[PDB]
Each structure stands twice: as structure tokens, then as C-alpha cells.
Amino acid sequence: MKLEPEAEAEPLDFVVATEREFEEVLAISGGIYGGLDYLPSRYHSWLRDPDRTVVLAKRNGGVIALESVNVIDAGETVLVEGLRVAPWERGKGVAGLLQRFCSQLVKRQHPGVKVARLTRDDQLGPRELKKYRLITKQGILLVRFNASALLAGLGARLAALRTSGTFSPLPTEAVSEAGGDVARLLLSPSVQRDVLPGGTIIQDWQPYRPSESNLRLLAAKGLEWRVDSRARPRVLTLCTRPFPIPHGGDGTWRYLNIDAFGSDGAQVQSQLLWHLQRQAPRLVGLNVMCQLFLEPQLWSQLADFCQVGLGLELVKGYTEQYLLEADIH
Numbered sequence: 001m002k003l004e005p006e007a008e009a010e011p012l013d014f015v016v017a018t019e020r021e022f023e024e025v026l027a028i029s030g031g032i033y034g035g036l037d038y039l040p041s042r043y044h045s046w047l048r049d050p051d052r053t054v055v056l057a058k059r060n061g062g063v064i065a066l067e068s069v070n071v072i073d074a075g076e077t078v079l080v081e082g083l084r085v086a087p088w089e090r091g092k093g094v095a096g097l098l099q100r101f102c103s104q105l106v107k108r109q110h111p112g113v114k115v116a117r118l119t120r121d122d123q124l125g126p127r128e129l130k131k132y133r134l135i136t137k138q139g140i141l142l143v144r145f146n147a148s149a150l151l152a153g154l155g156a157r158l159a160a161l162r163t164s165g166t167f168s169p170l171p172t173e174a175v176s177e178a179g180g181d182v183a184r185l186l187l188s189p190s191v192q193r194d195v196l197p198g199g200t201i202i203q204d205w206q207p208y209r210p211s212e213s214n215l216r217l218l219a220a221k222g223l224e225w226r227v228d229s230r231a232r233p234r235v236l237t238l239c240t241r242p243f244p245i246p247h248g249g250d251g252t253w254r255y256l257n258i259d260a261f262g263s264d265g266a267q268v269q270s271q272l273l274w275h276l277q278r279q280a281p282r283l284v285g286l287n288v289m290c291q292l293f294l295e296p297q298l299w300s301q302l303a304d305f306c307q308v309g310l311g312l313e314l315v316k317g318y319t320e321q322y323l324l325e326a327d328i329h
């Protein structure tokens with residue numbers, strides 16, 4: 001005998017999101033990522049993206065879940081982002097149903113897509129190891145500071161570090177995306193093999209294969225880049241413009257994401273400093289969650305630099321960002 005389908009008194013309805021559901025989406029998003037949720041600041045942007053479909057699950061006419069799918073890598077990849085289920089609806093399989101609906105939508109709307117990708121920091125287990133390939137991983141360093149405090153004290157801390165011989169920042173080199181420097185870096189086969197994690201660009205949790213088509217997407221975001229040497233690149237860093245996050249409930253917090261590629265810890269330190277000096281003046285009067293993604297064996301060095309050297313507070317211990325990939329059949 002076959003298993004008969006279970007009747008549902010309150011079946012889920014899956015619909016494409018519009019601006020009118022923003023407040024309902026906020027209402028299901030309390031506490032996400034400990035206050036580092038980007039969706040409040042990004043939801044309206046998402047609605048404009050040409051290769052993105054933002055799907056809502058509704059029950060009894062009310063939004064209870066959300067997932068975004070976005071086609072990238074010149075049509076070969078769908079990136080899954082933002083997956084969330086209202087707290088009062090969790091533990092019932094809702095996320096599983098929403099993911100299945102979105103997979104069906106991708107198969108119908110984007111028949112050329114070959115794989116799905118996503119990033120996560122949750123501990124991976126045997127199940128994850130069978131559904132996904134691990135493309136790469138980075139360590140995650142999360143620190144917090146008041147920008148006015150950093151602005152007032154940073155110069156004097158650097159002076160003390162320099163005069164004691166403990167730390168002076170090494171020279172770094174300018175990278176102009178408009179001038180073609182980013183393309184020259186990211187399209188280099190040697191950069192791809194030796195600098196980028198698993199040959200991939202990760203920008204504020206979003207993975208991109210290094211290709212002309214993806215560089216266009218990166219170039220519209222207003223990123224800031226730095227490198228140790230354009231001629232012989234070994235450490236490349238990427239700062240995403242800071243954006244408001246709900247942490248703290250008061251509107252005073254911003255999220256500053258820096259992705260660091262390569263293995264020279266001293267250059268990661270110098271480039272981190274460079275980005276903080278670039279970004280802090282516009283953050284005056286605000287509080288900052290700064291999250292640095294870097295090769296795992298550099299985490300302790302950079303955590304010490306941030307805390308003891310720069311006077312920033314460590315928010316949590318070591319965690320990892322996993323880039324996961326599954327085939328679409």
C-alpha cells in the first residue's frame with residue numbers, strides 16, 4: 001500500500017514578496033543572527049534585483065516564512081539567502097516545504113541552473129555532509145566598538161604600538177575597481193588558485209565565481225578593496241559599505257563586513273586597519289559590529305590585534321563560515 005497525503009487544515013500558500021509585506025517580514029524576523037540581520041536594510045533592494053525571486057509562505061493569509069533565490073555565476077548557480085520561519089511556526093517542517101517550493105520554482109523558471117549555493121555558520125553534521133559539498137570555509141571574527149571612541153583613541157594606540165616596536169602597519173596598495181584593478185586581480189588564475197578561498201569570492205556572505213559577469217554585480221555595490229601588492233598579490237581585502245542592523249533595538253548599530261583572502265596575517269592586520277580608518281569617520285556617533293572573515297589559522301592573531309592592539313571588544317569565540325553547494329537535478 002502507498003502512503004496517502006496528509007490533509008492540511010491550514011495549508012501554506014507560497015507567493016512572491018512585495019513591498020507591502022515588509023512589516024510582516026520584520027515581524028517574523030525577531031532575533032535573527034543576534035541582531036546582525038541584513039534584511040531590514042536590504043528587503044526593498046531585493047525587490048529590484050532582476051534575477052532574484054523572494055518567496056513568502058503564508059498561513060491563514062499571514063506571512064510566516066521567507067526565502068530568496070538569486071541566479072548568479074552566468075546562470076549556472078542559484079544562491080539561497082534569507083531563509084527564515086516565524087518563531088511561533090518553527091519546528092514543524094515549514095522551512096523544508098518552503099525550500100522545496102523554491103527548488104521547484106528554480107527548476108521551472110531557471111532550467112539552466114546546475115547547482116544551489118548557500119553560506120552558513122552552523123555546525124555541519126553527517127547529513128549536511130551528504131546533501132552538500134563544502135567548497136571552502138573561512139574563520140569568523142566578530143568585534144564591536146563605538147565609532148567615536150575608536151576615532152578618539154586609535155591614533156594614540158597606534159603611536160604606542162609603533163614606538164614600542166610592537167606593531168607598525170605594512171605598506172598596502174590601492175585598488176580601483178573603476179580603473180580595472182579588481183578585474184586584474186579576480187580574473188588572475190594565480191590569484192584564484194592561491195589567494196581566494198576555494199577559488200571563490202565571498203562578499204558579505206555572498207559567493208561569486210570569479211568571472212566577468214559576476215564582477216559586474218560586485219561593481220554596482222560600492223565596495224572598497226585593498227591589496228598587499230597589485231604586482232604580486234597575496235592578501236586581498238574587501239569591505240562592504242556599512243548598513244543599519246536591528247541589534248540593540250535603538251537604531252544606533254551598523255554592520256561592517258570585511259572579507260580577507262590570503263595567508264599573510266601581518267597584511268590582514270594592516271588592511272583591516274586601513275578599512276577601519278576609511279570607514280570610521282562616517283560612522284561617528286554610531287555603534288559598529290565589525291565582522292572579519294579570514295583564513296582560520298590567522299584568527300587568533302587578528303583577535304589579539306583587535307582586542308589588545310586596537311581596543312575593540314570580541315563578541316564571541318571562534319566560528320566558521322561554510323560555503324556549501326548542492327547539485328540541482
Ligand SMILES: CCSCCNC(=O)CCNC(=O)[C@H](O)C(C)(C)COP(=O)(O)OP(=O)(O)OC[C@H]1O[C@@H](n2cnc3c(N)ncnc32)[C@H](O)[C@@H]1OP(=O)(O)O
Nearest residue numbers: 032080081082083084085090091092093094095096118120
Ligand atoms: C539561507 C539562509 S541560512 C540561515 C538560516 N536561518 C536563520 O538562522 C534564521 C532563523 N532561523 C529560522 O528561521 C529557523 O530556525 C530555520 C533555520 C529557518 C528552520 O526553520 P524550521 O521551519 O524550524 O525548519 P524545519 O523544516 O522544521 O527544520 C528541520 C531541519 O532541521 C533538521 N532537523 C533537526 N531536527 C529535526 C526534527 N526533529 N525534525 C525534522 N527536521 C529536523 C533537518 O535537517 C531539517 O532539514 P531538512 O533535512 O532540509 O528537512
Ligand SMILES: N[C@@H](Cc1c[nH]c[nH+]1)C(=O)O
Nearest residue numbers: 033081082083119120205
Ligand atoms: N545564508 C545566510 C548567510 C548569512 C548572512 N548573515 C548571516 N548569515 C543568509 O543569506 O541569511
Ligand SMILES: [Cl-]
Nearest residue numbers: 166167168169
Ligand atoms: Cl609590525
